[PDB]
Design a protein around this ligand. Sequence first.
Ligand SMILES: [Mg+2]
Ligand code: NA
Ligand SMILES: [Zn+2]
Length: 358
Amino acid sequence: KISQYACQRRTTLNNYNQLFTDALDILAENDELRENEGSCLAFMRASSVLKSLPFPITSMKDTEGIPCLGDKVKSIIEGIIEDGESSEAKAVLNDERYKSFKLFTSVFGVGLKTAEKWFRMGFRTLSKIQSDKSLRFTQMQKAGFLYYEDLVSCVNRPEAEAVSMLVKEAVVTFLPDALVTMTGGFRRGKMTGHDVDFLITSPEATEDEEQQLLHKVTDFWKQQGLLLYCDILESTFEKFKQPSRKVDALDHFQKCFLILKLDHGRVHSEKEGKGWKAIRVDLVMCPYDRRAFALLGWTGSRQFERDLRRYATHERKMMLDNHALYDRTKRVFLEAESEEEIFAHLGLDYIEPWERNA
DNA sequence: AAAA
Ligand SMILES: [Mg+2]
Ligand code: NA
Ligand SMILES: [Zn+2]
C-alpha cells in the first residue's frame, strides 16, 4: 500500500509516468497562476504519487490502490491513455495568460504580481517589456534581464561543482572550520537546475562571526569582479521559538541570493562566446546545532518537505521546520546531528536525498 | 520577490 505521504515513498529520477506527470504539473501550475490553491494541491499530490511508481501506467486498472487520484485526475489519465496527449494540459499551454505568466516569471525578479501587471498592460513578449521607455524595473529585474540567456539555460553538474569550489574557497578563507554542503535538486541527483544552493555552518564560529561570513564572502567576490547581483537577508532566527505551524514554512536563517560570474576555465566538462556564464547561487548560514534541520529543509523537494511537515503534525503531534523539531506530547525540542536522526525521531524509514524527488 |  503506497502511502499518501511523499516522506513514506521513494521517488527517484527514473520517472516512468512523465506523460501523465508533465500534464498534471502544467495543470497544477495553471491553478497556481489562477490563484486556485486547492486544485493546485490536488494536482501536485497526484503528480507526486505517480512520480514514485516503479512502472508506467498503461491502463486505468494500473491506477487501482494508488492514493491521491481523484475523479478529475483519473479523467486526465484516461485521456492521455486514449491518444498519448492531455487535451486539458494542451489548452493550458495555448492559453494566453498562462504563456505570458510563464514567460514573464522566467525573468529573475519577476513574480506573479509584476507578471499580472504587465499582462493587463497588454505586454506579451520580453522584447516589448525590455525596450519599453515608460516601465520602471527593480534592481533584481535589471539583473534578470541583463543575464537572461545565461539564467534561463540550465545549470549542469560540472557548472554546479565549479560553483561549489568557488563557494568553499571563499568561505574557508574567513571560517576554515566551516562545512559547506550543496543542497536543492543537485543533492537529490538532478543533472540540471535553475540555480545552485549551499548550506554553510561552522562548529566554532561566534554569533557575530556567523553573521559576518556572508558579508565577507560577497565583498571578496565583489573585489574579484565576480558578484553580478547580491541581496543579503539578515537572520530573524529565534533560538527558543516553537517551529512553524504553516503549510509552507518560512526560513528565518541569514541567506543571500546571488548571481555569480562563472569563468569557463573553472568548469571541467566534456565541452565559447564571452568566456563566462551568469549563475544563480543561494547561500544559507545556520547555527551549527540546527544544521540537520536546515539541510533537510533545503534538500527538498518542495513536495517532500510539505509532506514531512504534514506527517510530523498529523501523525506524530510534532512540529517541524528548517530550524527545529518540537514534540508537543513530551513538551521538548528534539535534537539531531543528522537527517537520519530527524527521520528516526519522526518514526520514518530513512529516505535518501536521491529518493526525495517527490 | 528572492526561497527547497
Ligand atoms: Mg535548487
Ligand atoms: Na521570476
Ligand atoms: Zn536556490
